[PDB]
Design a protein around this ligand. Structure first.
Ligand code: NA
Ligand code: NA
Ligand code: NA
Ligand code: NA
Lengths: 251, 251
């Protein structure tokens, strides 16, 4: 499976000038090994990112709606994104599930519509503190993946990437170890194998989407079931390149 | 009060090519009388709208978040919008209150942050079918406006426009008359007068945000307390210009 690194800028930077500076930085980075790099940015910066970003990397939206267009004030749709030539979106990020109240049925509908319309998706999942403390992480995560599975059309698993977020380690006072990341990526892979078969499970990139930095990316990349990263704050910094280049430690 | 017409494209059109065609159409329209025109479009089309739209009109976002930037995947913020030179946003549209579950506290926080950061806002309100049928429209609408009022900083009411949406007449099987529009715009004006004083109430543009078309804009514009429109589907059509030009019938 080709190592995969997505840079999620989240709601940053504040200005188009800063977005442009950051893109110029990314454009000059020397990538080593073999890695698929995707960069996700706020909607209003997507046109400039699409125009200016190095052509060997791909741009991603950070969310889309469930419909092609219509009476959905404030929402951006798959056709709009594709009209710029953008091929990816993130879906189901913990911040949207939590702050913006997106539920599993909404997210399944987005995955279905996105894929049926030629998009590739980075679909996020992961359990909260109480399920982690109860030792019920795999059950929680399995229920999420099981909502996702029926949305994937036949022949589209090549267009699906899954990101595991250890939400239990985000603003909770607990930290995730390298072994935690490996264990949950493997839990997801096994759920896929059981539910949709080994051939799909062996192809789907599963990413670690907890805290990824230059000081922990090499050890994380080396975990056998970690196929890359959905990077948060380091996406905005020169250390993003170290994370991209961690692929040489994954086999 | 200067007549005010906002064109809310909502989640339309599907493609940047269509957005550009529509802007070329708007650019050649002959406006009559005196009217302030604002055009709101999906986030990904805002840069091209800002670059290409006639300079005597202003661009608007259809929503913004409550914060300047941060861990809010999918969200667009006031600084991002302003970095393009965009001066307006819509807030609290019925579609966002309903479909995207935005509550009055979220919306008050957005109004406060937006105005404290130099934005102008079109703040939407309006009652649903049951409150309309119960004859409790003014109570419902007053509660909304009362949540809004504390968010407005001193000296910023010149940067506030309020749009009344008859949600009870949207997908319910009931239609709004011209007298309904007038009555609710007046209810809002009186709430302002009582709560923040006559000088503010006499300055604030209150718009009708129900169904506005070339066949009903002139009669609506003539209502004394209707100061313009937040236009839905006709924003995407040549009839938008008829609606802009209805200002000559308002006194
Ligand atoms: Na395929
Ligand atoms: Na690995
Ligand atoms: Na002022
Ligand atoms: Na009038």
């Amino acid at each position: 499976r080709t190592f995969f690194v997505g840079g999620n800028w989240k709601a940053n930077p504040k200005t188009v000038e800063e977005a442009e500076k950051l893109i110029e930085m990314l454009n000059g980075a020397k990538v080593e090994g073999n890695v698929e790099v995707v960069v996700a940015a706020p909607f209003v910066f997507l046109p400039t990112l699409q125009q200016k970003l190095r052509k060997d990397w791909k741009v991603s939206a950070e969310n889309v709606f469930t419909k092609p267009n219509g009476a959905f004030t404030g929402e951006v749709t798959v056709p709009m994104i594709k009209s710029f030539g953008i091929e990816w979106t993130i879906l189901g990020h913990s911040e949207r599930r939590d702050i913006l109240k997106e539920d599993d049925e909404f997210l399944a509908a987005k995955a279905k519509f996105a894929l049926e319309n030629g998009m590739k998706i980075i679909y996020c999942c992961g359990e909260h503190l109480s399920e982690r403390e109860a030792g019920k992480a795999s059950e929680f995560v399995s229920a999420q993946i099981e909502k996702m599975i029926p949305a994937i059309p036949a022949g589209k698993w090549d267009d699906v990437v899954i990101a595991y977020e250890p939400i239990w380690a985000i603003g909770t006072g607990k930290v995730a170890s390298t072994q935690d990341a490996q264990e949950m990526c493997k839990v997801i892979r096994d759920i896929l194998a059981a539910k949709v078969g080994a051939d799909i499970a062996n192809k789907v990139r599963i990413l670690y989407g907890g805290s990824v930095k230059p000081n922990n990316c090499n050890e994380l990349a080396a975990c056998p079931d970690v196929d890359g990263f959905l990077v948060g704050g380091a996406s905005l910094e020169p250390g993003f390149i170290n994370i991209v280049n961690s692929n040489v430690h994954s086999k």
